[PDB]
Design a protein around this ligand. Structure first.
Ligand SMILES: Nc1ncnc2c1ncn2[C@H]1C[C@H](O)[C@@H](COP(=O)(O)OP(=O)(O)OP(=O)(O)O)O1
Ligand SMILES: Nc1ncnc2c1ncn2[C@H]1C[C@H](O)[C@@H](COP(=O)(O)OP(=O)(O)OP(=O)(O)O)O1
Ligand SMILES: Nc1ncnc2c1ncn2[C@H]1C[C@H](O)[C@@H](COP(=O)(O)OP(=O)(O)OP(=O)(O)O)O1
Ligand SMILES: Nc1ncnc2c1ncn2[C@H]1C[C@H](O)[C@@H](COP(=O)(O)OP(=O)(O)OP(=O)(O)O)O1
Ligand SMILES: [Mg+2]
Ligand SMILES: [Mg+2]
Ligand SMILES: [Mg+2]
Ligand SMILES: [Mg+2]
Ligand SMILES: [Mg+2]
Ligand SMILES: [Mg+2]
Ligand SMILES: [Mg+2]
Ligand SMILES: [Mg+2]
Ligand SMILES: [Mg+2]
Ligand code: NA
Ligand code: NA
Ligand code: NA
Ligand code: NA
Ligand code: NI
Lengths: 468, 481, 481, 480
């Protein structure tokens, strides 16, 4: 078992320690080859064929790059080879919980199929990591390379999902606090997962990446902030950090929240819902699970991938007919039709647990002029989109710490005022898109009148008339 | 309704005429989203996630770029908008016949499952195009945009598969001969399908493309060669054309024939073979097909994609157990082990019908080394790979014609010795790779001794690591020392 | 005298019409090989070795791309081959008036050397174009290719500098109004010069940008707005347009206004000022000009390039000693030292005529700290930088018009609040950087106390490192705590 | 301490403070004013890059390779001192280049100073010595743990080779591998090529297909015939053949472009005409010429591409002939390409025969009605050697490899073990002929002299031979 070299188009030739190779070469990790990073966005950007697997390799690589760079510049942090391997493992494994079509699964499908459950891809990642470790004999291999599984499994999970409920972490003590800001940074959102997907998604989408993670790594240092060691950026680089969140927002606008990519995601979700009683996934002890229950057994979840779409598409069973017909309509490009768009006024946000009530509100609106067609709640889709800098209404740069060239061990803060008067004054907004499943010209005309009336009833922004 | 613009990572924003959009938006074309361009190469190069779909859009785009450029520089060729659309449709549709994991299917699986049949992805493409046209009402849309379906369907199919039986084509007459050199060029191999996959495979593999197709297009013209209109290159550019085939050969060497990518393809094929008697695919009239017979019914073939690998991998049926276990071993990376590589010396070339005899020959070699373990024929895989410049033994540049700046419509020939002494003297070769299915350290040591002995017995080239893997076998052969 | 092909790293293989080749192959155009696009930026970003020449070729190319695209999609605009060539010539020639080190010359040097004169690179380009045309016999070549020089020279100059003198242009009538929005767009700043330098500067600097000009061209059309034909964009593209100006601002912040690039430009300017009495440049009729007067005679200006820096650096004349010493200090990297950066709060714009008073204000600040070393006004440089979206306080997207796909002849406006709440609220600001000419550790410590005190006195923003550089000064200001 | 520089090819590069002290000198900054590709900028408008940025890249890559070897093989005992010395040598190996890079040492000096034997490598050693002594670098070297007597010798040896059994004095035999990084005289594989492949491609608009990072990942040091050498992985042999194929490509497409070369020729002819009259001040106020500035590093420090513009902008009547040549370049009134041929076999025209070739072309007797009659001085004959960096030899015969199963055991690999599609020779010559008389009748006649000369000396048929000289190509049955 020696170092393996892998050639990635984004990062070039990456070295994998043999413990990481042992983790990668398992059913639970290889599964990520069959889950598209961008889900339905491939049906809009034909270059966006990339899967979660290759992204995970990239995240693991970058996690290793940052921890190594901090260790080389600051030997006093006493970063050990054990620490480095743990950080790489967490980076590699933080996408293990994603389901079919990535964000479609946790963002659209599970909230509709299992409204009572509180599922996140992060919790899924921890559950899947645990299942990976336990099914493949990884603990004794960890010991063989000097990891202490009791402490180090806890550390890896904590880096993925946060404190597993004073210093709240158990995997490492406070003097290694900075290690928890690499893989998933809950304090300000600056972490290696974004860095990989900015570069990788851009390469495949055909949009150029404008953030330079390498530069950020070169300038990162650890300093003491309120009696905790934290990753700090150079003061001068504050503008690049505002630009990094601007880039994320751009990618959301152009690609991840594309109105057609989103309706494709919605149609796939509607097909899974219609198929859910009939697709069977075998889990532990030969028990049978459904698409919506596979999250309750990691053996079954291991086998839940984008394949489910083609299982439905290629089915012949008449019980799957309605589900299959939705997917067939995607192939013919007979999509549910865009009716229009609005925004809430102020800092008003429609919360997730109101999502399912919105189609009935639109259908119950009492429009402008009398109508020939009457539409019902189930004829409307109402897609609520949050665009923000990753910290709800907050400016994430208020939660970054900086150092100056003349005192590189002294952390400081920088306010927005001190940076630039051309920056945004708000950091979150919401867009509401409405679509109609009835596509004839009379239904669509009526759907538009319901929509515009609803906007007026809710005091939302007056829709642009756009087309018509 | 209207023209669509699509953002492709290789070519940027490309325009799709509404007839092309009508062809794209069908189950027969969208199928190509579920077939990986490089098959098992993704299990070696993790960037190589791209599918035949986006390649096909790129081929159609490039076909349109070349035909438009010829028409703009030479209005005297009388290239019509109808011709342009036909050439674009052929470029878009020339990959329709590919099967699961692309070259694995027609290159490895079908030859082993149906040895009596003569299947190519080209014939597949023609059959699938026909099925696409007839199942989706495309003929009246063709008429609406000025095509004459009977004649233009024939032209499109001819551009894909070649003459469908003195001028042998029926789709266009002799004065548009150059149109048959864009999508699939049977005379010299220079066509737009290569240009797309050079750029696209490189972008995703993480290897850089050295050929500039745009430059070639700027310098291409049509001239009369031996009473036929042909696409000719500028004289000066002959070196770039040698380099283009050198690039193709490089991509084969580095990626498409990667020794581990090939063994993964071989293991996937062996899994499909073991699954073939049990997976059912419904086709026309509700008739049932197998993976190996789905090529005989386009309705069934429409539903034969890379999904088959996951159908096998996730199955619970006990009859699929042997097939599923192969794929599981791929996931654990318990792959058949590479033993080594050699080439025939001279002009002898091992023919397909001798492939099955090779594992027995390796196993019957008599290495004079201490061996504990004894291996059998079935413990060895022998993979024979043909590397050439696309025209078997021939130099494809001897089949290109050139023009000079002082007489741009007058075609000439250029010989290899007029270009450079640094160019190849031979244009085809074979590589032979050996692998062992027994993976332990003693089996692999023994497999290496049988291998190197067999090479010496057959007068093949000395393996590159031959002195390290078989130090006691290499001194016997005086040619190697 | 047919089409020449040129390989550019940004745009690939570009075609040049023979008239454009005749204009390029003149001393007045080739001069742009010896002027760096980014001036002193090369001394910070070592990839930024590119010259105005190659930028100009790119601008000409893009001007041709946009005008061709509009003419192909909208034949009713009656865009002629003559119009296309005129637009290409204007794009090619709009950088002809640049001086040594590009923006250093018109932005720093000429304002200080000739405070009474009003010089811009645009006026320079018109004067240089006229000199190019008249010295090289271009008018008969223009006629040969169907241009009417009297009208078309006027058109080309107008496209560079704006109306030369109710429809104010004389080169083309109102029905070709949209032609004046390609090369230099004074109405909203969207023109092809930016598109080239975004791509080219990024390629050389080692910074990437996410603006796609090709996409913009696909979605651009000409529509009637308030009885004038204008270039409009598809409604969906509004976000991209905000991003395009965000990218320009980024490039300014990261590269063009780099604090060290600017101090290098300042030191080069100070060297030119010290050399200005002594360098002689021969112009028309053997008359002698200085660096600062060469703008008054295009024959002399033709010979005024970045070479002046090396003429000074390599000189032995004792009268050039002070100038030469400055440049030698640049080579040793003994640069003026950066003290810090602040911004005015509110809508205080510091005006140009107050620039010279700022060093005295910093030096007169009364920091309330033990200061052993004493600094003077002449020890401080104060560089005031205006950053904006190209139309001072205005949002340039308020001056773009957009069309919906289903009504492509109806242009409308889109307001900022209809696009996003996360957009800027202001479109112009100023940065003030302070530097010290005394470079030792004690001088710099003192300079930082003067600086931070001055900021507090003027109610400027708290410098980012303010608490580290001036720990005794920042607590006085309650606004900062 | 460490300075960060953003380079477009390598990204953000760290420079140790000793390297920064070397860079920030007049002797190093000079390289900002010397174009990497000389006259090639007049053909490829992207090729504006200078020797400066290339040098930074070479230093960076030298550091990357030595660090990689030291991290994978701690038993080599590579010290931080060794690393810095290797980086300094990489940074400084281009210091000796002159105006327009290869034009200076390849065309100008051989013609202006035929008695002297000058190379850019010797220039680099002289310039390095001058840089060190004029800028007080020795005490800074000591401050960072270098021993200047030994380490200056090592750096110079890495640039120019052995300065007089193990022939090097800067390091002993157990660090032999250190001398294969910056300039590898045994097989040509070094970091200078790797930088210019990537950088020249970026600026030319041609894409690089060699992956130096991959080579570094697979490089190891093994004992070969009792010497420690840098070896490559056996599998990677194909990539190494491709690396020299890429170099040959870049030469064919760009470095030896027929117009780029004629522009270099015309620039050289201008310098020769200016050489008696341009003065460059050097040490002690002594005056030097363009051709003698190589003898005094203070004057050479001030000899850059500026000399072209000094000539172009001059008014001195003694510079008139030189200035007129350069003005003709601006108007694109260039000497005209007549054609191209190659010697047959392994026949090779030697440098000392170059000047006699125009007389041979002019003395050819074409057998055609010619109104115009041309003389020796109307012809330029440019002889170009294209090879894999070791004359007739295959450079892969001088590479050592290791196998995965015995990474300490070096082996050799022959060409026939790799592929039958590889080149059968590793060197050739191209001969290009140009005419200084540019009218249509002169050029017609020049083509007949040219094609006749080719037939007389059994040379290869010109590619357009049947269109340029339809009445001359029928002589030769090999061509028909
Ligand atoms: N010539 C090449 N250029 C670029 N990438 C390559 C090349 N050959 C292979 N690759 C890629 C494929 C992988 O992602 C990565 C490692 O492949 P390779 O070095 O061929 O590993 P291997 O595991 O097959 O070899 P081995 O086990 O013999 O060392 O590099
Ligand atoms: N801002 C962008 N930059 C780059 N690519 C984009 C951007 N927005 C969308 N794309 C991609 C996705 C598609 O491949 C292609 C066309 O998408 P888009 O312009 O959104 O067309 P559309 O079909 O969705 O809208 P419409 O029908 O209204 O023109 O461009
Ligand atoms: N093989 C190549 N690949 C890429 N770019 C090249 C190549 N050869 C030349 N170039 C560049 C240099 C110029 O910028 C542009 C035109 O070169 P080239 O076609 O050689 O023109 P030319 O003027 O020398 O030829 P001619 O006048 O015979 O047509 O292309
Ligand atoms: N935002 C940026 N993105 C990319 N490159 C940058 C950026 N800003 C500066 N550069 C380039 C210019 C240089 O080649 C290199 C170092 O610049 P920079 O870090 O600004 O150095 P500095 O020497 O001005 O700062 P200091 O001395 O304060 O640390 O990075
Ligand atoms: Mg391996
Ligand atoms: Mg993330
Ligand atoms: Mg996100
Ligand atoms: Mg659309
Ligand atoms: Mg082909
Ligand atoms: Mg092939
Ligand atoms: Mg030419
Ligand atoms: Mg600095
Ligand atoms: Mg040499
Ligand atoms: Na964390
Ligand atoms: Na204008
Ligand atoms: Na500036
Ligand atoms: Na050496
Ligand atoms: Ni560049």
């Amino acid at each position: 078992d020696t170092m393996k070299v892998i050639n990635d188009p984004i990062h070039g030739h990456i070295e994998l320690h043999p413990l990481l190779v042992r983790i990668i070469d398992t059913p639970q990790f290889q599964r990520l080859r069959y889950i598209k990073q961008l889900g339905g966005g491939y049906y809009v950007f034909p270059g966006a064929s990339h899967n979660r697997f290759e992204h995970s390799l990239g995240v693991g690589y970058l996690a290793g790059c940052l921890v190594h760079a901090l260790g080389e510049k600051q030997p006093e942090l006493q970063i050990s080879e054990r620490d480095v391997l743990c950080v790489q493992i967490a980076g590699l494994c933080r996408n293990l919980g994603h389901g079919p079509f990535s964000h479609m699964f946790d963002g659209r499908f599970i909230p509709l199929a299992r409204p009572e459950v509180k599922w996140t891809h992060e919790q899924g990642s921890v559950m899947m990591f645990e299942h990976l470790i336990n099914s493949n004999g990884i603990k004794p291999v960890m010991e063989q390379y000097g990891l202490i599984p009791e402490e180090d499994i806890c550390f890896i999970k904590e880096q993925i999902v946060g404190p597993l409920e004073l210093w709240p972490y158990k995997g490492r003590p406070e003097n290694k606090s900075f290690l928890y800001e690499i893989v998933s940074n809950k304090r300000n959102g600056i972490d290696v997962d974004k860095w990989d997907y900015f570069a990788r998604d851009c390469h495949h989408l055909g949009i150029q990446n404008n953030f330079d993670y390498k530069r950020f790594i070169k300038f990162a240092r650890v300093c003491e902030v309120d009696n905790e060691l934290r990753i700090c950026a150079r003061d001068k680089e504050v503008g690049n950090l505002y630009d990094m969140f601007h880039t994320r927002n751009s990618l959301h606008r152009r690609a991840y929240q594309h109105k057609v990519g989103n309706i494709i995601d919605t149609m796939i979700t509607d097909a899974f819902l219609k198929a859910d009683d009939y697709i069977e996934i075998t889990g532990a002890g030969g028990k049978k699970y459904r698409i919506s229950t596979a999250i309750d057994d990691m053996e079954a979840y291991t086998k839940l991938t984008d394949n489910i779409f083609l299982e439905i598409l290629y089915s012949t069973d008449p019980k799957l007919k309605d589900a299959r017909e939705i997917l067939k309509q995607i192939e013919y490009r007979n999509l549910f039709k865009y009716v229009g768009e609005t925004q809430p006024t102020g800092q008003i946000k429609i919360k997730r647990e109101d999502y399912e009530s919105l189609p009935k509100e639109v259908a119950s609106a009492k429009p402008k002029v009398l109508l020939d067609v009457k539409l019902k709640a189930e004829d409307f889709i109402v897609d609520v989109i949050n665009m923000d800098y990753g910290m709800q209404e907050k400016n994430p740069i208020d939660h970054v710490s900086f150092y100056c060239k003349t005192a590189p061990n002294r952390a400081i803060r920088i306010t927005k005022n001190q940076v630039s008067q051309l920056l945004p004054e708000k950091f979150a907004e919401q867009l509401i898109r409405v679509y109609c499943k009835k596509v004839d010209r009379k239904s669509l005309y009526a759907a538009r009148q319901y929509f515009v009336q609803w906007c007026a009833d809710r005091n939302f922004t007056k829709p642009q008339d756009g087309d018509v």
